[PDB]
């Protein structure tokens, strides 16, 4: 997250860190949202590589013991069937991970609330992106969980020529674009949390930013629209 501030430890309890095994250690690669005690929602592109993945819930500082972490293996990966790794702009950048154990819920570990199917946010709706992604274009991952205030940019503006054009689909949510604050690499798969009728809900799954840079004016961060996948999500969970 570029232009973020450190999250309070209990603000975003559904945020997870998706990590892969490297050497005798683990490396953060992406975010995720805990949606059942044994299921995480993330970006399809986060799991294209044939790596060994684990999920950390109750995580705050990737580089320090917080006393609140639970570590769990990924047992099964269900990528959206229409996902095409060579075409992120086509959409479908979503995957569900079934965890090897059910995590224990507490003030640091909670299920993310999802919007009802079809819900679209009005332009300029208040949201926060959260993650441990790069804090600058071509930068380094955050140690502590970051948040940034990123208001939505509706489909009509986002898909206009000076923004993202035909690259953005109605199955996505755009947010930010101010040139200061944005998602960045390593935020992929994580939540966009938007305040609606008094409650935060996870309306986006971080998908992409410009090849030019993370915080580029009129290239808001783009997210898979969660409310386009409610039926898909339920179908997967019910069959697995
Ligand atoms: Ca930690």
Swiss-Prot record:
Q: Which family does it belong to?
A: Belongs to the peptidase S1 family. Elastase subfamily.
Cofactor(s) for this protein?
Ca(2+)
Q: What is this protein called?
A: Chymotrypsin-like elastase family member 1
Binding-site list for Ca(2+): 59, 61, 64, 69
What does the entry's cofactor note say about binding and number? Binds 1 Ca(2+) ion per subunit.
**Which enzyme type, at the first EC level?**
hydrolase
Q: In which tissues is it expressed?
A: Pancreas. Basal layers of the epidermis, hair follicle and sebaceous gland epithelia (at protein level).
Q: Where is the active site?
A: 45, 93, 188
InterPro entries recorded for this chain? Peptidase_S1_Elastase_sf (IPR050850), Peptidase_S1_PA (IPR009003), Peptidase_S1_PA_chymotrypsin (IPR043504), Peptidase_S1A (IPR001314), Trypsin_dom (IPR001254), TRYPSIN_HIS (IPR018114), TRYPSIN_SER (IPR033116)
What is the top-level taxon of the source organism? Eukaryota
State where the protein is found: Secreted
Please give the catalytic activity noted in the UniProt record. Hydrolysis of proteins, including elastin. Preferential cleavage: Ala-|-Xaa
Keywords carried by this UniProt record: Calcium, Disulfide bond, Hydrolase, Metal-binding, Protease, Secreted, Serine protease, Signal, Zymogen
**Got any disulfides in this one, which pairs?**
30-46, 127-194, 158-174, 184-214
The record describes the protein's role as: Serine proteases that hydrolyze many proteins in addition to elastin.
In terms of PANTHER family, this protein maps to: CHYMOTRYPSIN-LIKE ELASTASE FAMILY MEMBER (PTHR24257), CHYMOTRYPSIN-LIKE ELASTASE FAMILY MEMBER 1 (PTHR24257:SF0)
> EC number(s) for this protein?
3.4.21.36
- List the source organism: Sus scrofa
Give this protein's Gene Ontology molecular function annotations.
Answer: metal ion binding; serine-type endopeptidase activity
Lineage of the source organism? Eukaryota, Metazoa, Chordata, Craniata, Vertebrata
Q: Name one GO cellular component term.
A: extracellular space
What GO biological process terms does the UniProt entry carry, in alphabetical order?
proteolysis
Q: Any idea where the Peptidase S1 domain is?
A: 1-238
Record Gene3D superfamilies: Trypsin-like serine proteases (2.40.10.10)
Q: Which CDD domains match?
A: Tryp_SPc (cd00190)
């Amino acid at each position: 997250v570029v232009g973020g501030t450190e999250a309070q430890r209990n603000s975003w309890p559904s945020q997870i860190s998706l990590q892969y095994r490297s050497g005798s250690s683990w490396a953060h690669t992406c975010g995720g949202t805990l949606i059942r005690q044994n299921w995480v929602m993330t970006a399809a592109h986060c799991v294209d590589r044939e790596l060994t993945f684990r999920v950390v819930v109750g995580e705050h500082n990737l580089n320090q013991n917080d006393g609140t972490e639970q570590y769990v293996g990924v047992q099964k990966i269900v990528v959206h069937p229409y996902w095409n790794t060579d075409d992120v702009a086509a959409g479908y950048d979503i995957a569900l991970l079934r965890l090897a154990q059910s995590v224990t819920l507490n003030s640091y570990v909670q299920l993310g609330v999802l919007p009802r199917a079809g819900t679209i946010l009005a332009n300029n709706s208040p949201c926060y992106i959260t993650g441990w992604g790069l804090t600058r274009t071509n930068g380094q991952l955050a140690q502590t969980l970051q948040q940034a205030y990123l208001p939505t940019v509706d489909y009509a503006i986002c898909s206009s020529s000076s923004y993202w054009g035909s690259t953005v689909k109605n199955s996505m949510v755009c947010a930010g674009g101010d040139g200061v604050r944005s998602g960045c690499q390593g935020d992929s798969g994580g939540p966009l949390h938007c305040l609606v009728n008094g409650q935060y809900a996870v309306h986006g799954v971080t998908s992409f930013v410009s090849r030019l840079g993370c915080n580029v004016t009129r290239k808001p961060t783009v997210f898979t629209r969660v409310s386009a996948y409610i039926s898909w999500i339920n179908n997967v969970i019910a069959s697995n």
